[PDB]
Symmetry: D2
């Protein structure tokens, strides 16, 4: 409400088989995510690419987890390859990682519970990158169901061509027609309705920077056409906020939350986009990529950097995420330790250990690595198994 | 030389099939590891649990990579679970991770090569944890071959019971008989000879702290027996450096390098162990776990912490590794960023970005994440594919 | 009732975390399996090693599916290796295959449902081989939970040593002490209680043929000891029906159903075992391996072969399974087609096609391969997605 | 020779990194496949979807193995789902299965070798389905390298749209422009040259039945255009042998072997296609799908069915394959056994066992299942490990 479903309950009933399988984590996740998005000033989250990263995010009091397809491409995909962000990896990598994260969170819940603690809420909703769906609408249908099986709370889909898909901050992005992008959003809602789960659907547009379109088939896209075509037969279009706004407005009836990929953290741009959407869709949830490909200190003065998320929240950007935080934290911390260890050996490692001891003041516990991974929990299991007679 | 093989070339020929498959990375790795161990004062390395961690280790000038089974248990296993260090995860997890790491290193090599750079040697040898072999000698045979397939340079095996196996710093460790541990080392050399690769074999003993033994079957273990037995029927033994030394000496003919698990970074202990081994096996390679479960600054003054690895090198500890560096770096860096992001949003993230920019002075490049993951490399691929006519 | 749990509800509550995840297929499976076992003369099933084998078993009217660890070892494990039956493969292979099978059954249910048919009940309970648990009781705890996650209805555990474990029809089998085997059965019930699912637990004994024991620790096993020990330090025991009966009776309080591995399909032996169990445990469910390693026509005359399962049912063997049916059907059918195709090309293939057309008389539909795999179902999905306007 | 590469050795050198990894099975496979295709009247093969199916194919004297993407979709993909043939599964499924098959063949080689037999040549070349490449040319580049890593000898690529891709015998197939299909073939040769392996490349066209085209961009495709466009904006084209022939001729410089998907086993059609290709490309290798979706006995009289492959060989169809033999053999054999087992229990199973005993006359050995899976081989391994003193 007011979401459009261009199909009937009977359509859903015919396609869902005779038995309904319960997806507890996906149901909890979507419920909690939807409450949070309507009750908080905003939700801020960071990219996680391992169960331990996502565990520390929750442990530090973040209320949501972001699963980045870019990070999956780089360091956590089922091909075990390092890829750039071009949908090169196996389409089940993302859902598999969402499962691993929920497994880590479930183990944390088990540790804290076995010690009589409930001070951390471990089951933070996961919002997951489905890219451009790894082909057509049936591929979208499958990745959506896989994410619900894995326990994702929300899933995002973008209007780039899957076969030539790119990082949101790479040149030469290719839009698919408006009607094709809406068909993907309908495929995603159909997958959620078939699984019987109120999963959040985020519609991303790449139309802010995208200067190429696959097909002139859709009347709604032709106004942006220049009349040039390329060797490949792509149509040249006028990228910018007018194209982004068009797509945003076309997708709003079919998605819970709208996201404009941005080439620069610009609050005036953000406000103009927000006001354009809310003019036709009052109160529509928006999402904002706080991109690590932005040089925050070079673009913004300290006051704006500190105010940025709060300002974005007041405009309607209720979900704000640093997509590549996990990559940067992982690569930075190992490089820095490695570079110092090369020269100074155990002095370099003692420096990290001392940083860990300092963070214990703020609830960090992984310095005590044996307890952190569940050694205490499995020792309680062993003792129950060994405990009673015969 | 002087390694003992209690079997013949004919035995190997009968078991190796009719075709010999080449394992380039495993052959390069074992060759380079063996040269390094004989030409350098020592090799120091850190635990890596992702391809990106291992890439930053090489990029910072570390000459070897350590694959920790503990880290696999925690955050990088094929069950996608968080486990403590009790051989709970699927036995192919470790070799799979070694493949992923070599894949990341291979992609780095491809990036640097496509830019006309050869200043980094990317194929750093990987020394991998095979635990207690995930069952009997045939399980040892399989994990050894899997590691060679994955491109490991060296593999370590310990004399704990696989079914009750534990972290080297957990209480209640259980030794298997000397003869059983030697049989595992023979299984590992047989696997390497069958694959036709000079893979390094490390024999770890847990006999420094282990107070329990499965069986009195071996004459060599009975001197350590007290005569007590437990409910489970384990034999109580006198743990300590005399037990560790016995096992070390029993394993030396069957392993390239010897490793005594230690409960404390103690140079006098280290020297006594080294001198005990070299008294019968002059020049025998040793390995030393620089354990993160040690409180380095609480146990050692700054001069000893700074000298520690250099001193250990001079005694014969030519391979020194911080087993859980990857876990600590990953958990610490995401907690710290998360805790600050919770309060201060993009100020917290700009602080990490600024740390990344500072590390560029020392060769860090992942701040430029697009190039780091191979966007330039795959854009050269796309251009060759698109480049010529028809 | 009367099952023994040597632990409390409070023990279970402490170990199960704060949220209870629903396992619909595992709950349905255990419920349906338990009803069937108490209402039918008996249940007969065949080994399945692919989703399609299990689909044809259900389609032909078999009421249960058997997941063989032997078949997993041969042709369906996560190492992608051909293994003999010695617990050589990754411990998650079995549960993964149970998931794949339930996925195939779920797709069948979706096809038949989308066509307005409910004449096949697709969700046949799966009884799965957990071997000797892939190590100790904690490994048992993990494989039990993995099977419940995958949707198994029942799981079996045997009293062989995991590290030297063997095919039930291989020589030199090694029993673990009675107390150790009971501890594994307690670990399995604890895993099921923690997941909140009434999963069936089958206790297999290998004590009919097993002539070796790991430890004299248990008073209950010493009567079978000869007083000889081997090089490895195994104890020699008197294998036979008296040892099998002892173990069966020791395991009965801790398992729902008892299974004696047999070296020969002998109804008098079967009756003696049944009568021995029911003398202390009236009405106890039993299970019987109708082994394909038996030469049925060489051992039994036609009347006995035809009566065999019915006779076994009347004794209390309510679950009867041909463990390796899937292996034999798969290897036989491809060899036979291949051998004829080598000589006669498409004549050989037309002969198979004609056999398929003949089986359509009995409900076979896979000749129509396009519909069989869900082409119709996904074409209905595509049409709902494409169907409504904008 | 005369293959066109629209790129230079320098292009390949820049993209291949600094170290060349050996792919023994892929090199052997491509070499043996290329010799066979030039020395034999023709090669006939069957679809295999497990290592055991492929082992029985080799054991029966077939000289090649076919890896079907359709069969992967149905019963052997990394999503563990039953899919129709629409590129729905994870793109690494096919290469993973090629690895499993080579693993089974390697184990067979090890068994026969350990017994002093070399009468079977186990390393039969595998020709593998890469579909339409699971996206764009970079996705093609990755699946080609993955197949070479897995040890495929040859790989096929078709000119259908990946996102709307379909079974070769499904209606509503969509061609991509000629230039796009050639770009995929260039991506595949670039991947093989980068890996340093002479892998066979097969170009399939779907233009015999395909009535839709994505784009009018290519001058070579416009002659087939009617001038109608659909809702989706696809161009209507005149399907048939003239379109198939055009594509075949466009692809011939860029592929080793050409394949026209056919809706019917018609020798006159086959001859016309062959003669059309050889008129411009004398001696060009062709491949022919002997489709199981054809009703062989309904379409052809017994003489033609028996002569069919021999006739096709003489025209230039040197590689002939029944794509779905594995699916039909697996589904048929389990249904038939299941249906009989439901009624007659062990009589039904004894009937299969008796069929197995009869096939032993022609070299079938899987009735002796213990030896078949390597129990003898691993018992020789155990004995070498246990054999020598200390």
């Amino acid at each position: 409400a007011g979401i459009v479903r261009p199909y009937t309950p009977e359509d859903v009933y015919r396609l869902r088989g005779s038995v309904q399988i319960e997806y507890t984590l996906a149901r909890m996740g979507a419920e909690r995510l939807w409450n949070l998005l309507h009750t908080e000033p905003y939700i801020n989250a960071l990219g996680a690419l391992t169960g331990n990263q996502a565990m520390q995010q929750v442990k530090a009091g973040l209320k949501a987890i972001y699963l980045s397809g870019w990070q999956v491409a780089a360091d956590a995909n089922l091909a075990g390859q390092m890829y750039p962000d071009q949908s090169l990896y196996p389409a089940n990598s993302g859902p598999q990682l969402v499962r691993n994260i929920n497994n880590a969170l479930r183990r944390a819940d088990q540790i804290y519970h076995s010690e009589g603690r409930n001070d951390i809420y471990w089951f933070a909703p996961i919002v997951a990158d489905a890219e451009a769906g790894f082909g057509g609408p049936l591929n979208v249908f499958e990745i959506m169901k896989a994410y619900i099986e894995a326990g994702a709370a929300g899933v995002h889909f973008e209007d780039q061509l899957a076969s030539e898909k790119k990082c949101g901050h790479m040149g030469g992005k290719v839009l698919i027609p408006t009607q094709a992008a809406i068909r993907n959003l309908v495929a995603a809602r159909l997958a959620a309705d078939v699984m019987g789960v109120p999963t959040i659907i985020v519609a991303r547009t790449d139309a802010n920077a995208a200067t190429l379109l696959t097909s002139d088939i859709d009347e709604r896209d032709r106004p942006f056409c220049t009349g040039e075509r390329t060797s490949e037969g792509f149509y040249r279009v006028r990228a910018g906020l007018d194209q982004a706004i068009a797509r945003g407005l076309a997708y709003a009836p079919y998605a819970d939350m709208i996201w404009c990929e941005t080439s620069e953290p610009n609050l005036e741009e953000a406000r103009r986009f927000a006001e354009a959407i809310h003019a036709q869709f009052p109160g529509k949830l928006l999402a904002y990529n706080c991109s690590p490909s932005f040089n925050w200190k070079k673009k913004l003065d300290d006051a704006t950097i500190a105010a940025f998320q709060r300002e974005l929240g007041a405009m309607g950007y209720k979900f704000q995420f640093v997509t590549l935080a996990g990559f940067h934290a992982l690569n930075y911390s190992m490089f820095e330790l490695a570079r110092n260890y090369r020269d100074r050996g155990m002095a370099a490692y003692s420096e990290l250990q001392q940083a860990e001891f300092a963070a214990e003041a703020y609830g960090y516990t992984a310095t005590r690595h044996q307890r952190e991974v569940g050694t205490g929990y499995f020792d309680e299991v062993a003792q129950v198994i060994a405990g009673g007679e015969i």
